[PDB]
Amino acid sequence: EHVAFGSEDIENTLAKMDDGQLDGLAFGAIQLDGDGNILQYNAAEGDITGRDPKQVIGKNFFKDVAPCTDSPEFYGKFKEGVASGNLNTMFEYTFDYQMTPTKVKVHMKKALSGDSYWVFVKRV
Template sequence: MTERLRFESDNIFNALADMDGEAMNSLPFGVIRLDREGTILEYNLTEGQLTGTDPRKVMGQNFFRDVAPCTVNPQFYGRFVEGLEKGELDTVFEYIFDHQMATERVKVHMRKSGGEDSVWILVKRL
Protein backbone atom coordinates (compact mmCIF):
# COMPACT_ATOMS: atom_id res chain seq x y z
CA MET A 1 0.00 0.00 0.00
CA THR A 2 2.77 2.49 0.85
CA GLU A 3 4.45 1.95 -2.53
CA ARG A 4 1.46 3.43 -4.35
CA LEU A 5 0.75 6.11 -1.77
CA ARG A 6 2.11 9.46 -2.87
CA PHE A 7 2.34 12.87 -1.20
CA GLU A 8 -0.23 14.23 -3.65
CA SER A 9 -2.66 11.29 -3.40
CA ASP A 10 -6.29 12.17 -2.78
CA ASN A 11 -6.62 9.38 -0.23
CA ILE A 12 -3.37 10.02 1.64
CA PHE A 13 -4.98 11.15 4.89
CA ASN A 14 -7.44 8.25 5.02
CA ALA A 15 -4.56 5.85 4.44
CA LEU A 16 -2.43 7.49 7.16
CA ALA A 17 -5.17 7.02 9.73
CA ASP A 18 -5.03 3.24 9.12
CA MET A 19 -1.23 2.88 9.03
CA ASP A 20 0.92 1.41 11.72
CA GLY A 21 4.27 2.95 12.64
CA GLU A 22 6.30 0.66 10.39
CA ALA A 23 4.26 1.54 7.30
CA MET A 24 4.37 5.25 8.16
CA ASN A 25 8.15 5.07 8.58
CA SER A 26 8.51 3.57 5.09
CA LEU A 27 6.91 6.58 3.38
CA PRO A 28 9.27 8.73 1.29
CA PHE A 29 8.05 11.97 2.94
CA GLY A 30 7.77 13.31 6.46
CA VAL A 31 4.62 12.70 8.47
CA ILE A 32 3.75 14.59 11.64
CA ARG A 33 0.46 14.52 13.54
CA LEU A 34 -0.28 17.18 16.15
CA ASP A 35 -3.08 17.79 18.60
CA ARG A 36 -4.79 21.21 18.73
CA GLU A 37 -2.10 22.61 21.02
CA GLY A 38 0.73 21.47 18.75
CA THR A 39 1.80 18.43 20.80
CA ILE A 40 3.42 15.78 18.61
CA LEU A 41 1.36 12.58 18.40
CA GLU A 42 3.11 11.00 15.37
CA TYR A 43 6.52 11.75 13.85
CA ASN A 44 7.81 9.33 11.26
CA LEU A 45 11.38 8.26 10.61
CA THR A 46 11.56 10.10 7.28
CA GLU A 47 10.79 13.40 9.03
CA GLY A 48 13.43 12.57 11.61
CA GLN A 49 15.99 12.01 8.87
CA LEU A 50 14.98 15.25 7.14
CA THR A 51 15.49 17.27 10.32
CA GLY A 52 18.18 15.23 12.05
CA THR A 53 15.80 14.56 14.93
CA ASP A 54 15.16 11.27 16.72
CA PRO A 55 11.38 10.68 16.42
CA ARG A 56 11.27 8.95 19.82
CA LYS A 57 12.69 12.03 21.53
CA VAL A 58 10.16 14.50 20.10
CA MET A 59 7.00 12.54 20.88
CA GLY A 60 4.88 14.50 23.34
CA GLN A 61 6.81 17.73 22.78
CA ASN A 62 5.27 20.87 21.35
CA PHE A 63 6.16 21.03 17.66
CA PHE A 64 6.07 24.83 17.41
CA ARG A 65 7.76 25.71 20.69
CA ASP A 66 10.21 22.85 21.28
CA VAL A 67 10.97 21.16 17.94
CA ALA A 68 10.53 23.66 15.11
CA PRO A 69 10.38 27.22 16.46
CA CYS A 70 11.24 28.43 12.94
CA THR A 71 7.58 27.65 12.08
CA VAL A 72 6.14 30.20 14.51
CA ASN A 73 5.17 32.73 11.88
CA PRO A 74 2.05 33.60 9.87
CA GLN A 75 2.99 31.32 6.97
CA PHE A 76 3.11 28.11 9.05
CA TYR A 77 1.75 28.49 12.59
CA GLY A 78 -0.70 31.16 11.47
CA ARG A 79 -2.28 28.74 9.00
CA PHE A 80 -2.44 26.05 11.70
CA VAL A 81 -4.26 28.32 14.17
CA GLU A 82 -6.54 29.92 11.59
CA GLY A 83 -7.55 26.56 10.16
CA LEU A 84 -8.40 25.17 13.59
CA GLU A 85 -10.39 28.28 14.49
CA LYS A 86 -12.41 28.01 11.27
CA GLY A 87 -12.74 24.24 11.56
CA GLU A 88 -11.35 23.93 8.03
CA LEU A 89 -7.70 23.18 7.50
CA ASP A 90 -6.40 21.84 4.21
CA THR A 91 -3.52 23.84 2.79
CA VAL A 92 -0.42 23.18 0.69
CA PHE A 93 2.51 25.59 0.63
CA GLU A 94 6.26 25.77 0.13
CA TYR A 95 8.41 26.46 3.17
CA ILE A 96 12.04 26.68 4.23
CA PHE A 97 13.06 24.83 7.40
CA ASP A 98 16.21 26.24 8.98
CA HIS A 99 16.13 25.43 12.70
CA GLN A 100 19.27 23.59 13.90
CA MET A 101 19.73 22.04 10.46
CA ALA A 102 20.88 22.86 6.97
CA THR A 103 18.33 25.03 5.19
CA GLU A 104 15.81 22.75 3.51
CA ARG A 105 13.16 23.84 1.00
CA VAL A 106 10.05 21.71 1.33
CA LYS A 107 6.43 21.40 0.33
CA VAL A 108 4.02 21.16 3.26
CA HIS A 109 0.50 19.75 3.22
CA MET A 110 -1.39 20.52 6.42
CA ARG A 111 -4.85 19.06 6.99
CA LYS A 112 -7.20 18.64 9.93
CA SER A 113 -7.94 15.00 10.62
CA GLY A 114 -11.49 14.04 9.74
CA GLY A 115 -12.61 11.98 12.71
CA GLU A 116 -10.13 13.20 15.30
CA ASP A 117 -9.21 16.54 16.72
CA SER A 118 -5.71 16.50 15.30
CA VAL A 119 -3.76 17.86 12.33
CA TRP A 120 -1.61 15.93 9.86
CA ILE A 121 1.44 17.69 8.45
CA LEU A 122 3.18 16.10 5.46
CA VAL A 123 6.63 17.37 4.46
CA LYS A 124 8.35 16.64 1.15
CA ARG A 125 11.79 17.85 0.09
CA LEU A 126 11.86 19.97 -3.05
Protein backbone atom coordinates in the same frame (compact mmCIF):
# COMPACT_ATOMS: atom_id res chain seq x y z
CA GLU B 1 4.02 2.10 1.91
CA HIS B 2 2.28 3.04 -1.43
CA VAL B 3 0.77 6.56 -0.97
CA ALA B 4 1.78 9.88 -2.67
CA PHE B 5 2.37 13.29 -1.10
CA GLY B 6 -0.64 15.51 -1.81
CA SER B 7 -3.03 12.63 -2.51
CA GLU B 8 -6.69 13.59 -2.37
CA ASP B 9 -7.54 10.89 0.17
CA ILE B 10 -4.25 10.85 2.12
CA GLU B 11 -6.02 11.18 5.48
CA ASN B 12 -8.00 7.96 4.87
CA THR B 13 -4.93 5.87 4.04
CA LEU B 14 -2.90 7.08 7.01
CA ALA B 15 -5.80 6.51 9.40
CA LYS B 16 -5.29 2.78 8.77
CA MET B 17 -1.50 2.86 9.48
CA ASP B 18 0.65 1.82 12.48
CA ASP B 19 4.07 3.34 13.34
CA GLY B 20 6.12 1.07 11.08
CA GLN B 21 3.72 1.73 8.24
CA LEU B 22 4.01 5.51 8.75
CA ASP B 23 7.79 5.05 8.68
CA GLY B 24 7.50 3.54 5.18
CA LEU B 25 6.11 6.69 3.57
CA ALA B 26 8.19 8.46 0.92
CA PHE B 27 7.55 11.83 2.64
CA GLY B 28 7.81 13.24 6.17
CA ALA B 29 4.65 12.91 8.27
CA ILE B 30 3.95 14.62 11.58
CA GLN B 31 0.64 14.42 13.46
CA LEU B 32 -0.13 17.31 15.86
CA ASP B 33 -3.00 18.06 18.21
CA GLY B 34 -4.71 21.42 17.99
CA ASP B 35 -2.20 22.91 20.47
CA GLY B 36 0.76 21.75 18.35
CA ASN B 37 1.89 18.85 20.55
CA ILE B 38 3.53 16.06 18.57
CA LEU B 39 1.45 12.84 18.45
CA GLN B 40 3.27 11.01 15.60
CA TYR B 41 6.56 11.69 13.78
CA ASN B 42 7.84 9.32 11.08
CA ALA B 43 11.29 8.14 10.06
CA ALA B 44 11.29 10.03 6.75
CA GLU B 45 10.79 13.32 8.62
CA GLY B 46 13.73 12.55 10.94
CA ASP B 47 15.83 11.85 7.83
CA ILE B 48 15.19 15.44 6.69
CA THR B 49 15.60 17.24 10.05
CA GLY B 50 18.00 15.20 12.17
CA ARG B 51 15.39 14.73 14.93
CA ASP B 52 15.03 11.33 16.58
CA PRO B 53 11.29 10.47 16.16
CA LYS B 54 11.04 8.91 19.59
CA GLN B 55 12.58 11.98 21.28
CA VAL B 56 10.24 14.58 19.76
CA ILE B 57 6.95 12.79 20.55
CA GLY B 58 5.13 14.84 23.15
CA LYS B 59 7.03 18.06 22.59
CA ASN B 60 5.42 21.17 21.17
CA PHE B 61 6.20 21.63 17.51
CA PHE B 62 5.81 25.42 17.32
CA LYS B 63 7.38 26.36 20.69
CA ASP B 64 10.14 23.73 21.17
CA VAL B 65 11.06 21.76 18.05
CA ALA B 66 10.43 24.10 15.07
CA PRO B 67 10.54 27.80 16.08
CA CYS B 68 11.20 28.83 12.47
CA THR B 69 7.58 27.66 11.76
CA ASP B 70 6.16 29.98 14.46
CA SER B 71 5.03 32.55 11.88
CA PRO B 72 1.80 33.65 10.12
CA GLU B 73 2.81 31.61 7.06
CA PHE B 74 2.96 28.28 8.86
CA TYR B 75 1.62 28.29 12.45
CA GLY B 76 -0.89 31.02 11.56
CA LYS B 77 -2.38 28.88 8.79
CA PHE B 78 -2.38 25.81 11.04
CA LYS B 79 -4.30 27.67 13.74
CA GLU B 80 -6.82 29.05 11.23
CA GLY B 81 -7.53 25.57 9.91
CA VAL B 82 -7.87 24.02 13.34
CA ALA B 83 -10.39 26.71 14.25
CA SER B 84 -12.41 26.55 11.05
CA GLY B 85 -12.46 22.73 11.11
CA ASN B 86 -11.42 21.90 7.54
CA LEU B 87 -7.60 22.22 7.32
CA ASN B 88 -6.19 21.43 3.84
CA THR B 89 -3.50 23.71 2.50
CA MET B 90 -0.03 23.75 0.85
CA PHE B 91 2.96 26.12 0.93
CA GLU B 92 6.78 26.18 0.48
CA TYR B 93 9.16 26.83 3.40
CA THR B 94 12.74 26.73 4.63
CA PHE B 95 13.63 24.59 7.67
CA ASP B 96 16.81 25.86 9.39
CA TYR B 97 16.83 25.38 13.17
CA GLN B 98 19.41 22.79 14.37
CA MET B 99 19.66 21.46 10.80
CA THR B 100 21.24 22.64 7.58
CA PRO B 101 18.88 25.07 5.77
CA THR B 102 16.53 22.87 3.72
CA LYS B 103 13.82 23.95 1.25
CA VAL B 104 10.58 21.96 1.57
CA LYS B 105 6.97 21.76 0.43
CA VAL B 106 4.43 21.43 3.27
CA HIS B 107 0.88 20.04 3.11
CA MET B 108 -1.35 20.49 6.18
CA LYS B 109 -4.52 18.37 6.41
CA LYS B 110 -7.04 17.48 9.15
CA ALA B 111 -6.81 13.83 10.33
CA LEU B 112 -9.79 11.54 10.90
CA SER B 113 -9.20 10.99 14.59
CA GLY B 114 -10.28 13.73 16.95
CA ASP B 115 -8.12 16.76 17.72
CA SER B 116 -5.52 15.55 15.20
CA TYR B 117 -3.86 17.35 12.23
CA TRP B 118 -1.23 16.17 9.73
CA VAL B 119 1.81 18.16 8.61
CA PHE B 120 3.44 16.46 5.57
CA VAL B 121 6.86 17.47 4.28
CA LYS B 122 9.01 16.75 1.23
CA ARG B 123 12.20 18.27 -0.11
CA VAL B 124 12.15 20.67 -3.04
